[PDB]
Automatic annotation (TrEMBL), chain A:
<keyword id="KW-0694">RNA-binding</keyword>
<keyword id="KW-0699">rRNA-binding</keyword>
<dbReference type="GO" id="GO:0022625">
    <property type="term" value="C:cytosolic large ribosomal subunit"/>
</dbReference>
<comment type="function">
    <text>Binds to the 23S rRNA.</text>
</comment>
<feature type="compositionally biased region" description="Gly residues">
    <location>
        <begin position="20"/>
        <end position="30"/>
    </location>
</feature>
<comment type="subunit">
    <text>Part of the 50S ribosomal subunit.</text>
</comment>
<protein>
    <recommendedName>
        <fullName>Large ribosomal subunit protein uL15</fullName>
    </recommendedName>
</protein>
<comment type="similarity">
    <text>Belongs to the universal ribosomal protein uL15 family.</text>
</comment>
<keyword id="KW-0689">Ribosomal protein</keyword>
UniProtKB/TrEMBL annotation, chain B:
<dbReference type="InterPro" id="IPR028909">
    <property type="entry name" value="bL21-like"/>
</dbReference>
<dbReference type="InterPro" id="IPR036164">
    <property type="entry name" value="bL21-like_sf"/>
</dbReference>
<dbReference type="GO" id="GO:0003735">
    <property type="term" value="F:structural constituent of ribosome"/>
</dbReference>
<dbReference type="Pfam" id="PF00829">
    <property type="entry name" value="Ribosomal_L21p"/>
</dbReference>
<dbReference type="InterPro" id="IPR001787">
    <property type="entry name" value="Ribosomal_bL21"/>
</dbReference>
<keyword id="KW-0699">rRNA-binding</keyword>
<dbReference type="GO" id="GO:1990904">
    <property type="term" value="C:ribonucleoprotein complex"/>
</dbReference>
<dbReference type="GO" id="GO:0005840">
    <property type="term" value="C:ribosome"/>
</dbReference>
<comment type="subunit">
    <text>Part of the 50S ribosomal subunit. Contacts protein L20.</text>
</comment>
Length: 72, 103
């Protein structure tokens, strides 16, 4: 019966909508907090950026070499 | 004829005939109840009080019905702090009737 069947308990969840009500828990901010960068539209911190300290991938020396012959 | 019986952690002013509302007790509908927790018994003018409980005296009552009287509301609100919470409540009761007083 197509009127009958349904999936397993826990297999589907329901995509919490931020910004509705006060009882739901996510209202009026959506889990972001207050003023700042990670609170605005496109508050993306660039990956690897530290804040102005010299990052890891620009303090350590290059040391590789890729031969050619492990391609065969 | 007035007694002071103690039903549910509180006492009453019972003079017979008594459509009287009590908090809910564990008995069916149409059964007789004896109250052995009577504190003073008066008759005409003849009035005696119990050192804690007066001896021998009983009040016979029987259950008319059960029900649930009210609908009270609860609002826990805090201004300016993004918090509000509501809840309903209806309390059980038991209407009895005294066919009682025994000195």
């Amino acid at each position: 019966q197509l009127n009958d069947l349904r999936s397993a308990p826990g297999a589907r969840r329901e995509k919490h909508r931020p910004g509705r009500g006060i009882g739901s828990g996510l209202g009026k901010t959506g889990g972001r907090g207050h003023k700042g960068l990670t609170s605005r539209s496109g508050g993306k911190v660039a990956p690897g950026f530290e804040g102005g300290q010299q990052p890891l991938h620009r303090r350590l020396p290059k040391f590789g070499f890729v031969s050619l012959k492990a391609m065969d | 004829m007035y007694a002071v019986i103690v039903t549910g952690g509180k006492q009453h002013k019972v003079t017979e005939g008594e459509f009287l509302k009590v908090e809910k007790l564990d008995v069916a509908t149409g059964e007789a109840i004896d109250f052995d927790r009577v504190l003073l018994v008066a008759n005409g003018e003849d009035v005696k009080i119990g050192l804690p409980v007066v001896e021998g005296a009983k009040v016979t009552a029987e259950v008319v019905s059960h029900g649930r009287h009210d609908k009270v509301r609860i609002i826990k609100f805090r201004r300016r702090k993004h918090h509000m919470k509501r809840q309903g409540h209806r309390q059980w009761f038991t209407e009895i009737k005294i066919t009682g007083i025994q000195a």
